[PDB]
């Protein structure tokens, strides 16, 4: 039970890392090339796209993945240099859990659960309101939901382990 | 007989992995660049293509390959950390077989056995119905049939081994 | 005499693999981008190209290379797991020879020995018959002839070894 | 207290290097392709872009990262060749700190803290003043602020260690 | 004297291999994209370019490099499998020398010593004679001369060694 | 004093190699794509660009880097094969210094110290004289000056070591 | 009363002739130039326009005007050549009235009372059904109604005169 | 006084007719060719222009000019055929005055006194609201005001004559 | 009867002349501008159109109209100069009738009774067979039939008069 | 002397009318078609041209010509209707002279004596200031000067006659 | 016999004048707009067309028609002013005949009897030889032959009259 | 002799007027549309064309024709108003001769005797010098020479008459 949780967490971490590394970059290759808007004003596309996607999904996910692994690096380097251990273990576990929960909440509040095909853009220099068409909405939505589920499972396992330790 | 089946399964797994890794990406490089439709309405191409191919073949196959290999990773990590084995072996074999059968059925119900050259698209903003032309139908069809045959052979071997174990 | 044949076969296999891996991919990089036809009908290019080159040369050659190496993998994995050997050796050699001969015959019946520069395309939606111009005919022809010669030499060596063993 | 500082510095260095190497290159892939200006004069784009971004962010950051690691290489090679050590250690630490502070000040005086979307270009051959639209302002601004914060933390840690040693 | 020649030959071989691998591909990346002709007939570009460069320089040089190294592979594999040596040594030296001389003569008779900027193309479907403009003539000429000099030095050293052995 | 010089030289060599390998290709990716001229004559761009940049900077720098390292390879291979040493050491040092000085002088006489934005092209087929606009002048100028300074420092160190040895 | 009818008829005839001659030609100058359809198939515009407007309004109105004036020419030429008069007068009046009524009925059954802006075209070679946009619908509708009213008034006056004569 | 009014009216009528005939057509020659809108939707131009200018100025003015001259034609033809005169004179004058007043009021309520340069168009198929730019606003405004003044003077003179007659 | 025929002939001649002069030119204004073909070969349009319409309808009809009126001019000038009359009258009438019959037969054998929308063109430089789309088929067909009927009526009247004279 | 002035004035009036009617329209045929501006903003051309040429020269000159001839029409119609003469003559002469002087002053204050080739346009929607190029400056300038001289001569003659009458 | 000749000549002159005036301009309206050549060099069209058609047919025919009628104008004006007659008549007839014969010979030597569709143009700036396609060859050829026949008939009649007079 | 000269002058005047009226406009219809230059700078065409042809030939010739006929109008109007004659006759003859000579000299000094096909334009905004290609050089040259010859003949006849009068 308690020992299994660590194995499950490690396997899930490896699985999510592999998924993000393999099927992450190529899906978002043509995000801006295929983004088009129904207007003739030069420079409307850039402003509308920037308003639509302030920070791409892949950037946020890669940053989260790199950030959640800092405690392991700190522990490994401390152990290597050594050659309050319980205090360090507790502190690192608590910090990892807090960071993961915060990142999950931020992700939920940033992107939501859908990527609508049509967007309304009304920023300078675009005149009045214009309509812009997104590329690949369905695949992006599926990937969003999948990543959210994986993160939720990770958070649940971490909370269970923390509760068990007490 | 029984011992040979494991070797055949491993060889087939390696072969399919190599095929997907080598002749998987470059075939689907220009899926959206060369997809064209007979209309002048801006944004019709994106919607029609999204309706035509919700999730590309390569993403589904890569996800299936990664998912079917999780039990091996779990077994290896558990064995490494160790330094009910029969129960774990039976459970992971059963889970792998069930996952493979489910994925095969899902693949059959998603794509079928053909990739027609011409498609009819009647989604917003395209007015009424329009005709769109796919790129590389024959090669995609051949690859679909080949992958289906490989998956069927794998399922048959797994079922035979499970029946033998009893 | 007999002992030299194995070394010659291994060297030839390595040489052909290196050639296919090094000068294979980039020669066929712009097969579809530079393929043009003399018409204005949208979608004629896709259908005409698909009719011209059902399965590209590189896919066929890579598949053949991967397929002809399965017996070695099977033998190696069986030997590793072990720690009728003569029967297994004979069976694997015979199967390899049969597969190679079949693949050579299929290649000869598929592509032939030339790649003409001009092609006549009369498939829907192209109206009546149209003329399409291929890219890089001479280099493709030279590569075809070279690969055919290499495969013929391999087949000759395998047949000689099989006859010697009897 | 003081001992943990070295571990924190090493972890931060690894983290910043990983971030720059992973999420740095592809963000600035289309800096010039998507840079457009509202004019018809040929060659205005080149001059205006060159005036807008004399030296891109990524080149500066890579150069800084490479430069701040020379003292470690010098120390390692000197130690290897050997097989006033304290004086050498003090000199290398002081030089590293001075270089880092100088680079941080230069970065602050070069780019600032914002990347405006609109720019006014009045260089030859562009007639009078023209307006040019930048691509991806928000993500670049976020990256700038993040790198500045990381560099500030590194400088603070180095100054604290130097004060502790004295 | 005699012993130095082997070291010189090995160093020259490594140097030429590195040069071809590093500054070989990127120079010839845009050979066909930037090749333009002064006409409006569709398909003239393909035929004229194919007539201009039947086989690119890089393909010929890579093939020569791979072909001249087969004797070393044969010797190494024979020695490995062993665990008439003089006869094999003499035979492989003679074969290498003959192959190198033949390849050098073929290169001289194929391309010559220059790459003219302007070319005259009079092949179907181009009407009458047309003029086409090559890309990067000077750099290609310099590379041709450099490779010819390197090959000449290699041939001279091989001939000297063969004469010394007698 | 004298001993530190070797460490400084090795560190500088590694630093310059890393700089050229990392920030070398990216800057010169679009040298010809973004080079434009103010005319309508087909083929003027190719001739004008070829006249502007006979041999790009990166090719020259890579060739120099590879050439200056041949003596080390020769020494290492000779030492390995062995298992007048002073004469060989002196000879290879002298040759390295001479080659470096010659390459530096050639670089100075080829490119100079600036890359002007505007160029005047008067070669066939361009009629009379035309004006062409370069891409990224400032960054190229900075890189030129930086490489010149690094080469000067290397030459100074080599001359100092040679004088010390006498 | 009876005498006034002839004056009113003549004035109305002159008025309609002047209107058709002055504001007729230039209103329909750009009927085909500004007619556009939402498709890329070549030749769809011609077929769709031909289906939309088999015979333009101006042709029909000019033909009617010329045809209704033949009896006057016949009467004038007969009178001139002369140098049953009542029978000729009655016959030509009856024929004029019948022709006018027939032409009015034909006009009503041909065009109706409106010119919709949007039209649906499904004729070869247009694929499936396409939408085409007409130019100047409102002005054409107003002109149609005005001409219909004028023709109705003329018919009423002619019928009244015929009834009065008895 | 009373006799002068008729001369003034005739002179003004001739002057306005000459103005409309000479500077009427060519001013409005390119009304639709130079009308442009800021959008990419096909067919938006036609609908937006039709909404902007239902009936052009020239058509209305020509129709008014032709309509106000019918009484003179009726009087002339009646006099010619003759070879209650006061009643006919009074009736024709009253009808002419009433028609002129009605046409002036209609003109005022239709077009107003200005022709703005920018218009907002929100009709199908144009998506949402778009902005369209008119051609030659100032000249059209001046012509409108001039014609209104001429019509007002004519109405004033006619009213004065009618009052004088009593 | 005998006298009325001349009046009918004169009226019909005037009517046909007016029709040809009024609704003849502007119908055929854009015969070549709107003629399009489905190909990319330059110059195919000119050859295909020339093959489709050797001599336009309007030229033939104008020439026929001018030719059929020469006898009247000859008679008038002879009468004027005078200041065998029956022989001259008979000769001119017979010649006019013969010319009209010949022209009618030629017209029937040239154009026929229809103007198909689609045409097949296989003349140099057009490659193989191509399809071209005509403009305004229905209106041209109606005009053809109308002119044929008018010419037939004229021929019938002339034959009747000739038979009556005997 | 006094009597000759009338003949000179009439001849000059006829000459100017002929010049304006013959060489006036064709020069100003392409005023707006060939007017171009150095920008990409849609609708900038219309606003800039409208600001450059509020009322074209030809409209002003035609209006002046028509206006200066009203007194002659009034006198002729009054004389015709008649079948204080000195008072009418004096009034008409004074009014004609005043109108001509006012029109000349207005022309001088409107256009001046030159038509510069380059213009600076800074009206909405044109961003900032843009430069626009006029068509045919020299011919327009010559015509302006010629018309000004003719008008000056007419004014001088009219003033001389008025002074003579006293 | 002789008397009829004058009538025939006058009728033929009127007929040819009418033909040239009616069906002369519209045929040659788009001579240069539809003239196209197979090249990309700017300015080749102008030079090639100028070489193809130095002086168009219509200009030559109009000039000939005007020139051949000068003697009649001279005779008429001399007779009018009067209010050696035989000598003047003979001189004018002889001069007219000589001019007509000279013009016919010049026409034959200029254009010939055909207008080939394809032309070869090899004038500056066109490089080498290019092929250009003419518009409307058949109709132009027919018109040429018709005009030649008419001129021949006129010359024959004039020669017959001159011989008769002697 | 003397009497004939007047008739010759009148006939020549009528002939030149007819030539200028008939073959004057059609030749110069596309002077600016077909004028092209070899550059991409916007607005270069306008400036270069304006420099090439400050005042077109047709404007100058029409102005000369109108100016040379003023004396006849003055004489006719004076004679009509009449209902020193020798003095007026002599004065107007002398003025006509002087004006004609001055206009001929001006024409010779303006245009010369040729219209070259290539022109060099070096005016703002065109950068450096550019080459521009004229349209229809040969026909314009022929027309120039013809008009010069006609004017010379007129001048010779006028001088002869003036000398005869004495």
Numbering used by the authors:
A (entry chain D), B (entry chain C), C (entry chain B), D (entry chain E), E (entry chain A), F (entry chain F), ...: 19 to 101, 194 to 276
Sentences from the paper on this structure:
To investigate the possibility that the pore-obstructing densities correspond to flexible NTHs and CLs, we performed a structural study on two Cx36 mutants: Cx36Nano-ΔN8, in which 7 N-terminal residues (residues 2–8) are deleted, and Cx36Nano-BRIL-ΔN16, in which 15 N-terminal residues (residues 2–16) are deleted and the CL is replaced with BRIL. The cryo-EM maps of mutant Cx36 GJCs reconstructed with and without symmetry imposition showed similar pore-occluding densities, indicating that the channel pore is obstructed in the absence of NTHs and/or CLs, likely by lipids.
